[model samples]
Target: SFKPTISVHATPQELSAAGCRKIVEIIEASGSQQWPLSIALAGGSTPKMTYARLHDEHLNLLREKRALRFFMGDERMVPADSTDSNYNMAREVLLHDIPDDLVFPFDTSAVTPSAEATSADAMRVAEAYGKQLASLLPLKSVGEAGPKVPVFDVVLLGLGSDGHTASIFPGSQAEKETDGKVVVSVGFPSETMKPKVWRVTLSPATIMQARNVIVLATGAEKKWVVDGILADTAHKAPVARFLRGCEGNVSFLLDKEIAENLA
Candidate 1:
């Protein structure tokens, strides 16, 4: 039931190249309309590589498009300039090629030095990000007069070895969000990743509405997760839930080594 289009490449660079092409195509096709195109970017080195590739090859093509907007799929509770910040990574790579007005990073100014402050600020940031998304992107109605939800043109995501995608870890409450929230605050004990802080992320309810959802995975560490996904044993993984939620629109861009090793 969670069938997704899978594309395998011989290497990481090739995967990134393919991913860039897909994004460019999405942008080009959407460019036919006057509405702004939206893209929710994923963090991690794999996505960073794709961003770099986009900047190196497609900068001029995309720069002229005033209708393009950039957003993060998830962001840690850190200043935009912090090394751990997803915004910083994108800024150093692809965002510089795009206009700053069209780029939306979770506001970190609300966060202060106190830990309590960080938690509270994460909630505020999530709410603000949700509002921003609702205001910029087109909204879809579930039924006649049903609540409208913003639908992004494209959303990029990356998988962690622990089966986490975006900021939704294995046990995250954000996974079960059906309240129509576009963004949410997620907290978890420090384990799979670093910083051990609160995070602001797009909810499954929101990501499910996207026109295109691309999940990228590479390196040997991802083999187990990809294998588990192919099997029936990993349904509880966050990424698995996403694959189910955004079934038809999802695409998995994987490296050949992992795809070949899967059983």
Candidate 2:
């Protein structure tokens, strides 16, 4: 199973820079091994700050020659232009400044109302993305008849105060999800000041399948959830469940404020 080495930072800014540098190092090292780097980008309050930092301080780290392929970990059900849209946040903050050729965002603007409304439609769109990923990934021969799987180099994640990560909110429909393609729509309540509409997020299975999973969290408010995850008890947060299943590496990147309470 995949268990990540945890790292704490004195500040969010420092954590963000460290995270970017770590990703850059992995991408460069993987490229040396002739492995194409596949990264699933996460957009949330904490990661948005990190993405902005990457835009300002680590822009050169995202150079076109790295051959880094990007995909969203999850997104809102709204249009890409919506202020709450993760794609919009990534576009305005990171992707807009980077080379367009290296990025591939899931088309949130699909004409249909639901990507999961029909299996054919869902597979049609998801398989296209999956195939694109499969081509760049090194095929693994499991056994005589086992199917090959595409492995991602790194999957960036953000933890919600409610102990949710990648849109797998507590008690949401996604919590009960056991099977589906790589991408699916999930509806969950927001743990914010105002209620949120439905959200479309990458399924937990997709996240767990990645080679590396790094979850970023900051602020004192998240301390309890962080501890709960580390404790590995009845709290059973979704983030913990996701981390528990990772077969590669799973880690939590936290700032001092949030890390202070962890035993």
Candidate 3:
């Protein structure tokens, strides 16, 4: 795995634009190569602006394209209409407005019995999501001879102030996942802070399968941990571990507020 090459932007606006470009670049590349372009989206405040921009001015890149596909890095086991649902947010911000056809998200309904707060059912659904994904992705073997994993063209991630990326939090088993490409039934420490429901995520190995990974971290609130990562100080954080294990190009798009202290 190679170290990530970081790009610090002057403003949140700049960061968002750059992130969208990264997405478009990979999609165009995949089309030129005659392979489907699969991308994974992250849910967080930092990416909302980027998604909005894509919906607003960049629809040209995604319009009426058959070779393009999309997936989520993680999803909460909440109602599709729930405001906190990651897919819901994307639909509200981009997917619903765009003509883009294939956006794959975790199976959120009917997997569990009809009920509220069904942790058991949610967990079961999470576990089954991997099987679902296995059936959809291309079977290009990884490591030269191993069974193939889903090879994403681009994966967009958001970094928490605590350095969590996607749903992989520090001290969580999701962080410990190595061989698997996708994980099911992940939860919060009763300390997930403010958020949604059941978590199903792409494992680190799955993320490494991506040809390009773009991380978006903004706000002054994130400065400390961003610097901690840059200065070799946050190795214990989940973001650090992902960075440590990644294979393809991992790029960072950080606002000035978040990158200012990284020297």
Candidate 4:
């Protein structure tokens, strides 16, 4: 498990500023290494704002990092053009000048669908997606005989009041994963936090392995769970275990409304 650090800001505007700063830090710390700087993205209102803020305020910083590539933290199984698409927001807000090839979206062949099928095609697409991630990332070296799970420089997460982060919702088998595979499908219809749609996401194993994990939550609506996480009050909140179980650096960024009643 990792030590959880909480940083509270008065408004999402403040968070937008702080989150952009952290992005820069991740770049500086993780960039310039032998591998590309891999940043996992999340979808949410605050994240969209954060991305735009980074676009406007740190144009120079991001423009300099040509090796930067964006990876989605988790995504809903709708088409990429769907408003719910995490990628739609990123494509809109970020003008990071990073090449398209470098920005790896978990390709779902999502035309309505290779790179994008779910359910009937889950195993194949997920396996293909894993190969894509491994090919691009700096995979860890467990041994000559065995390969290590690919580790990301940073994983940006959006907190769900239901206690999920990314698409690792409560009551899903996706939560129990700890093996080295980089991605998995929550394909096939089932109950989910919202939208109740199938999703594909980086597994808990992938999340906890990141070099830096930032969990961002904003608004009063998110307060209860945020405080509950701090108090260890929600036994079912996947975040409870995720924060408690993370083996790498993890930080929670909350706005004043969300942090107002933190225990």
How close is each model in CA RMSD to the real structure?
2.5, 4.2, 2.9, 3.5
- Model 3 gets an lDDT of 0.70
What lDDT score belongs to each candidate, Candidate 1 first? Answer: 0.76, 0.67, 0.70, 0.70
Clashes of 1: 0
Tens digits of per-residue lDDT for model 1, 4-63: 788989988899998998888877766647435888888888899999998898776667
lDDT of 2 by residue, 1-263 (tens): 33458889997678887787777677677664543477788987777776787678656657545446667777655567877778789889888876776677766566333432333443344556656656766544223444455667788988777778777777766665534334344555566712254555556655666778888888787787777766656445545454676666777788998889765
Candidate 2, residue 78: how far the Cα is off, in Å: 1.5
Candidate with the greatest TM-score versus the true structure: 1
Q: What lDDT tens digits, residue by residue, belong to model 4 across residues 1-263?
A: 23587889887888878888887777776656634577888888888888988778665655664646788877766677778778877887883355666677766554473244445544555566677777777776333444366778888888776667777766667776655544454533335356655677777776766788888888787776776666645664544355555556888888888888875
Best by lDDT: 1
Using all chains and alpha carbons, the TM-scores for the candidates as numbered come to 0.88, 0.79, 0.85, 0.84
Clashing pairs in 2: 4-250
Residue range with the least summed lDDT across 10 consecutive positions in model 3: 181-190
> Candidate 1, overall lDDT?
0.76
- The candidate, 1 or 4, that scores higher on TM-score is 1
Off by over 4 Å in 3: 33-35, 98-101, 111-119, 140-148, 181-185, 189-192, 232-239
Q: Write the per-residue lDDT of candidate 3 for residues 153-174, one digit (tens) a residue.
A: 7788887767677777777777
Which residue runs does candidate 2 get wrong by more than 4 Å?
1-3, 32-36, 110-150, 178-185, 190-195, 235-239
